[PDB]
Design a protein around this ligand. Sequence first.
Ligand SMILES: CN(C)S(=O)(=O)c1cn[nH]c1
Ligand SMILES: CN(C)S(=O)(=O)c1cn[nH]c1
Lengths: 262, 265
Amino acid sequence: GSLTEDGLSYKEKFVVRSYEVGSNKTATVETIANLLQEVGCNHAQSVGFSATTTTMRKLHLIWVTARMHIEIYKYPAWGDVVEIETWCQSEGRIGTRRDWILKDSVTGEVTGRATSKWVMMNQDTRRLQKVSDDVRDEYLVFCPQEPRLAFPENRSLKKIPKLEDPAQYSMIGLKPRRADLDMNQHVNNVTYIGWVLESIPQEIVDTHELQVITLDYRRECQQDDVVDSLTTTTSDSQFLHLLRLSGDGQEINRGTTLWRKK
Amino acid sequence: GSLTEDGLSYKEKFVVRSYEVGSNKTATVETIANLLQEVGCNHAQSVGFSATTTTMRKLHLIWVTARMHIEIYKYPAWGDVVEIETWCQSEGRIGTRRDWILKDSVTGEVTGRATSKWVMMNQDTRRLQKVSDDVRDEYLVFCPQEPRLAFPEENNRSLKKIPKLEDPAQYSMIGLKPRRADLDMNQHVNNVTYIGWVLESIPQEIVDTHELQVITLDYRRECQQDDVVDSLTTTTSNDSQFLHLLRLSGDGQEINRGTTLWRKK
Ligand SMILES: CN(C)S(=O)(=O)c1cn[nH]c1
Ligand SMILES: CN(C)S(=O)(=O)c1cn[nH]c1
């Protein structure tokens, strides 16, 4: 992996592994999501980050994902090489955005694209706050200043409603194991993708390919929490999703998926 | 990755990823186990398998893991490059063995080693059978003929007998269910998920103050996609040892048994 010539974006190549593929011998959406996180982390490292800036560490501030949107045209096959380009952009005082472009290394064609919105919050109180000018001049030097959108047109900005009971489908009692946690003992965001997809019926997974997924992150699931995954068909096939705590029903995530017939 | 010069073993390098590490910023045992599987799969592909031979595919036969033994001296850090060498050996008509050696690419020192015993089984009936001459002659050309053991020692931990944990267990984690990410390309539960499930009943305080040095797992039965498992652990012991058992949540049918050895950080 390396920063591009202008130092305003980062590229990395990955060879798809045997345990990273599903029944179609192609990478799952969770493997793609993991690769997006890995390339984002390598970009932050290459430009001297933790991605907390120097003023953020003093103030105990962190970037947290508010929304993630992924669109896949072709899932790479086991053994294929995928190239991913990522970059960040400031969204004024609202927060920041990280975008990605996925390409087949052999053909050079765009096989997927993703976008994510991040907000600043105090690490301890979990309270959101606007982006200060001091904590903006430090990260703007690593971002392109003219607009550069992975989704210029679109589905990434759609409003997501709250699923109403009764749900058409459900998977209950979902619990994270130690492998679902990151280096800071927080549940990895890719686990929420898996949990959302668990309530899609197996027949849909067997006859369709996931083309679009949009997730809004509302609250974190702790290590000792138990989650219920709820899905209702809103339609290609479209679904409305909701993850909530198994007991009191407190919302953790909401989302939408769009699936195409194979 | 590539076969070595003699074509009797295979090496591959991996750079440890951010999501592959735990609290110490080092690879978890599940990441190591995943890498062992990946290098084994690349070795079979390099020598023409897909690891069923031509006679095996004709008779609906497959290799299945009976026992897995891993010993880790140093877990690689996030960003470190680890080199893994793997090879197979015939164990007469009993079955086959796949061994691995893990090294730090920078220092060249052995940071870990693993061994696994595989048995031949009919894919549909799940009935075991001894290795015939026709199958043996097809895979022996890809194996070193003189002994090559990752665990040579005459009284090593890889060959120890594992007893069945007796109720009541000291610790337990109940209601464990596999999700779609725990399945392989053939919709079977990945063996690395059983490692995770075994480790779930180790108390968090032990995980926080110790590093896992050795893990031995005996595979008895496969967990289906709609099965629910209970993970049971009892301390048997500067070092801590545990006896483990995974069984079906309902009738208590055994799926796996194992042992772990942990050392103080
Ligand atoms: C791709 N998603 C899983 S995400 O946008 O939540 C993300 C990206 N880097 N870290 C989290
Ligand atoms: C390392 N283990 C998880 S294993 O020995 O069960 C194995 C190795 N390749 N496939 C399974």
